């Protein structure tokens with residue numbers, strides 16, 4: 505009740521910034537997440553004992569893969585934290601509750617392979633969930649963990665507040681399927697430019713939260729250049745493992761996933777920043793102006809990838 509989680513001074517100040525890195529000390533990540541829940545939501549939002557038990561079961565259900573791991577989960581929750589704190593008044597009490605949990609849970613039981621590889625391999629999950637295959641699995645594991653004894657962090661909500669929050673989390677997790685991002689941003693682009701965008705319209709909020717999820721999910725490109733660059737090494741470690749597996753099924757992998765096209769990484773990063781990252785944080789800055797630091801950081805990292813191509817790094 506009177507027990508505030510605190511952090512050392514450098515973390516207490518920098519955790520409030522979009523570019524914060526959670527650091528290499530795994531054992532601090534739970535405490536960092538609880539700190540973010542308490543400040544964006546209140547010490548009232550969750551029974552501390554249930555929350556801690558939920559956090560530790562979630563961590564246990566992330567795997568030891570180079571990129572889609574427990575650190576990624578907490579990184580994406582921190583970006584969401586930064587967005588919610590910079591837009592205090594735009595979000596309901598349930599959305600604040602739901603979205604940090606959604607971000608922590610959004611890649612639960614990821615195996616380091618794309619939806620496309622699961623379909624080519626003919627993995628059982630690809631018969632149970634024909635599109636957004638891993639993302640429907642992630643939401644399924646989130647419901648699972650919520651239903652374990654002592655793990656219902658939402659037990660103080662009404663039947664209907666409970667159903668609203670699980671529906672927020674479901675849509676938020678589905679939206680991290682990057683195949684869905686393109687259409688969702690196009691729609692938001694038009695709605696904003698024709699002034700039809702209305703945050704009282706539930707299906708409009710849904711799209712805005714979807715874009716926030718893409719923004720948080722991609723936030724490695726919004727960090728200090730050495731974080732951005734070292735995170736890309738983890739991303740490629742997964743992509744090239746998938747490419748190897750693709751070649752074992754007798755399938756030429758896409759360039760992203762072919763370790764024989766290492767040389768072309770800088771140009772692939774450019775395509776990605778131009779086709780996905782920049783448009784994402786641009787539309788997000790148009791809809792929520794205080795998130796401009798993410799656009800500005802993304803632009804800075806594009807410019808660093810351009811230097812790498814020119815030989816100046």
Ligand SMILES: Cn1ncc(C(=O)N2CCOCC2)c1C(=O)Nc1ccn2nc(N3CCCC3)nc2c1
Pocket residue numbers: 682721722724725736739759760765766768769770771772773775776
């Ligand atoms: C930085 N970042 N953060 C998130 C993502 C990402 O896409 N996702 C995160 C993992 O799950 C999938 C979604 C990335 C990223 O690197 N994306 C890309 C996208 C296209 N290309 N193409 C190339 N090359 C190199 C040789 C020629 C083609 N490399 C990339 C890298």
Ligand SMILES: [Mg+2]
Pocket residue numbers: 610611638680
């Ligand atoms: Mg994912």
Ligand SMILES: [Zn+2]
Pocket residue numbers: 576580610611680721
């Ligand atoms: Zn993710």
